[PDB]
Design an enzyme around this catalytic site. Structure first.
Site, PDB file in Angstrom:
ATOM      1  CG  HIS A  48      -1.948  -1.116   1.177  1.00  0.00           C
ATOM      2  ND1 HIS A  48      -2.979  -1.259   2.056  1.00  0.00           N
ATOM      3  CD2 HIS A  48      -2.000  -2.194   0.339  1.00  0.00           C
ATOM      4  CE1 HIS A  48      -3.643  -2.380   1.770  1.00  0.00           C
ATOM      5  NE2 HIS A  48      -3.052  -2.952   0.755  1.00  0.00           N
ATOM      6  CG  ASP A  49       5.101   3.465   0.970  1.00  0.00           C
ATOM      7  OD1 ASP A  49       4.489   4.535   0.871  1.00  0.00           O
ATOM      8  OD2 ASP A  49       6.344   3.364   1.057  1.00  0.00           O
ATOM      9  N   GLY A  67       5.056   6.604  -4.918  1.00  0.00           N
ATOM     10  CA  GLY A  67       5.476   5.195  -4.873  1.00  0.00           C
ATOM     11  C   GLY A  67       5.994   4.807  -3.494  1.00  0.00           C
ATOM     12  CG  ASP A  69       6.125   8.123  -1.238  1.00  0.00           C
ATOM     13  OD1 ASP A  69       5.453   7.256  -0.627  1.00  0.00           O
ATOM     14  OD2 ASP A  69       5.594   9.087  -1.839  1.00  0.00           O
ATOM     15  CB  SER A  71       3.417   8.653   1.211  1.00  0.00           C
ATOM     16  OG  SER A  71       2.746   7.541   0.601  1.00  0.00           O
ATOM     17  CB  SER A 177       1.978 -18.001   0.383  1.00  0.00           C
ATOM     18  OG  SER A 177       2.254 -19.320   0.795  1.00  0.00           O
ATOM     19  CB  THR A 196       1.303 -23.411   5.015  1.00  0.00           C
ATOM     20  OG1 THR A 196       1.237 -22.938   3.648  1.00  0.00           O
ATOM     21  CG2 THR A 196       1.083 -24.916   5.059  1.00  0.00           C
ATOM     22  CB  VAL A 199       5.171 -22.550   5.144  1.00  0.00           C
ATOM     23  CG1 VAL A 199       6.211 -23.075   4.129  1.00  0.00           C
ATOM     24  CG2 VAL A 199       5.371 -23.230   6.484  1.00  0.00           C
ATOM     25  CG  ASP A 201       3.421 -23.071   1.393  1.00  0.00           C
ATOM     26  OD1 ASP A 201       2.583 -22.154   1.206  1.00  0.00           O
ATOM     27  OD2 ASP A 201       3.263 -23.943   2.301  1.00  0.00           O
TER      28      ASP A 201
HETATM   29  C1  LIG Z   1      -3.391  -6.719   0.451  1.00  0.00           C
HETATM   30  N1  LIG Z   1      -3.525  -5.580   0.532  1.00  0.00           N
HETATM   31 CA   LIG Z   2       1.543 -20.599   2.821  1.00  0.00          CA
HETATM   32 CA   LIG Z   3       3.605   5.796  -0.902  1.00  0.00          CA
END
Ligand SMILES: [C-]#N
Ligand SMILES: [Ca+2]
Ligand SMILES: [Ca+2]
Ligand code: HEM
Ligand SMILES: *[C@@H]1O[C@H](CO)[C@@H](O[C@@H]2O[C@H](CO)[C@@H](O)[C@H](O)[C@H]2NC(C)=O)[C@H](O)[C@H]1NC(C)=O
Ligand SMILES: *[C@H]1O[C@H](CO)[C@@H](O)[C@H](O)[C@@H]1O
Length: 336
Positions: A48-49, A67, A69, A71, A177, A196, A199, A201
């Site tokens: 999300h940044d 991007g 940054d 923020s 995952s 998992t 893990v 995977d």
């Molecule tokens: C996933 N935000």
């Molecule tokens: Ca997993």
């Molecule tokens: Ca950002």
């Protein structure tokens, strides 16, 4: 050839501060180098940044976001009001304090904590870590983070604007995952997205393709779909992406090889890490990031389900030969 005060050997003096940040994060933020809720929150945060980056807004005469940054930390008052940023403030505050105490930029810290956190999760690849991103940021524009009720068209369009092809969207979703939800369905807190959640995977890709049979909670939360067994949560975006002709063959190709999955995820995370930046202007401190303990477990179809319970969605490739297990269906414990 650089020897930091700590006696670590590193490639560049600009890496030496990160050894102190490593020690702090592993003791404190990660509660002794563990792969639990902090890493999972950090992966939501890194996404999300970075995804607050929109060449289409720039092209339409508007600020599109900077991007990766930091923020989301520096302007948390604004960004944590976005729909997708719930359940993050406690983690954001933890990161804020670490960044200020060690004097590192917020954008670099988020990327570092991501690589460190991944390193605590069995099976993870070694993520690249670059340092040098300015601590300066403006607030992300609103409406740049994909939501679980969005159509595949909307998700691919948004991700595509940021810079990712459909294959790369699938590759980035390997993070699911290591994942649960807390905010979509309040009655099943930390219900995992795969069997998992500690893990790194291919289980996520396998299990999202199974027929949805099970309602894990007493009711449905936001953007919730039927899952394949008790305790597992399935969000609508993952269900759709697994099945959509634009993403299904890549999704299927992830199922049998942890090693290819890790390479693809590493590559996609490296790209995401420098949205808003020139990686050639940054310093490579990847040597600070250690390897994760290896994952020795094989991909499996859980619970005595078989390939017949897989909704095969790549019309040109046979489903890989994946081992099956004994019944009965598992019941997933909440992710720790
Ligand atoms: C996933 N935000
Ligand atoms: Ca997993
Ligand atoms: Ca950002
Ligand atoms: C492609 C679109 C994606 C959408 C719609 C999406 C949506 C979501 C939602 C709704 C949750 C549940 C949050 C909660 O209720 O607690 C979640 C969890 C999570 N997401 Fe995503 N996600 C996507 C991509 C990604 C990417 C690219 C990453 C990072 C590389 C990421 C990492 C995670 C992690 C690690 C969790 C688990 C958080 C926890 O266990 O606390 N997701 N995602
Ligand atoms: C990165 O920029 C942020 C925002 O200007 C700085 O964060 C402030 O830091 C001061 C001094 O430590 C704190 O008193 C404020 O609480 C922080 N504000 C926010 C919004 O976090 C931060 O110090 C800067 N980091 C570096 C290394 O310069
Ligand atoms: C089966 O059991 C697990 C706990 O062991 C639950 O998390 C799940 O909701 C189901 O009751």
């Amino acid at each position: 050839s650089v020897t930091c005060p700590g006696g670590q050997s590193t490639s560049n003096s600009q890496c030496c501060v990160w050894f102190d940040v490593l020690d702090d994060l592993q003791t404190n933020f990660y509660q002794g180098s563990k792969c639990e809720s902090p890493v999972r929150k950090i992966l939501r945060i890194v996404f999300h940044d970075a995804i607050g980056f929109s060449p289409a807004l720039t092209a339409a005469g508007q600020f599109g976001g900077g991007g990766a940054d930091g923020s989301i930390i520096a302007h948390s008052n604004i960004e944590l009001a976005f729909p997708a940023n719930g359940g993050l403030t406690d983690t954001i505050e933890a990161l804020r304090a670490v960044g200020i105490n060690h004097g590192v930029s917020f954008g670099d810290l988020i990327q570092f904590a991501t690589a460190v956190g991944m390193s605590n999760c069995p099976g993870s690849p070694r993520l690249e870590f670059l340092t040098g991103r300015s601590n300066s940021s403006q607030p992300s524009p609103p409406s740049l983070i994909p939501g679980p009720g969005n159509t595949v068209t909307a998700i691919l369009d948004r991700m595509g604007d940021a810079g990712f092809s459909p294959d790369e969207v699938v590759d980035l979703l390997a993070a699911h995952s290591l994942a649960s939800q807390e905010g979509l369905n309040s009655a099943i807190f930390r219900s995992p997205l795969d069997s998992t959640p500690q893990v790194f995977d291919t289980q996520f890709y396998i299990e999202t393709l199974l027929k949805g049979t099970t309602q894990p909670g007493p009711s449905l939360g936001f953007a919730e779909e039927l899952s394949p067994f008790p305790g597992e949560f399935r969000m609508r975006s993952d269900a759709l992406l697994a099945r959509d002709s634009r993403t299904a063959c890549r999704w299927q190709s992830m199922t049998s090889s942890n090693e290819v999955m890790g390479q693809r995820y590493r590559a996609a995370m490296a790209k995401m890490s420098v949205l808003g930046f020139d990686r050639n202007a940054l310093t490579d401190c990847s040597d600070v990031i250690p390897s994760a303990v290896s994952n020795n477990a094989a991909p499996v179809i859980p619970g005595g389900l078989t390939v017949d319970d897989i909704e095969v969605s790549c019309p040109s490739e046979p489903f890989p030969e994946i081992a099956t297990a004994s019944g009965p269906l598992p019941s997933l414990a909440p992710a720790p």
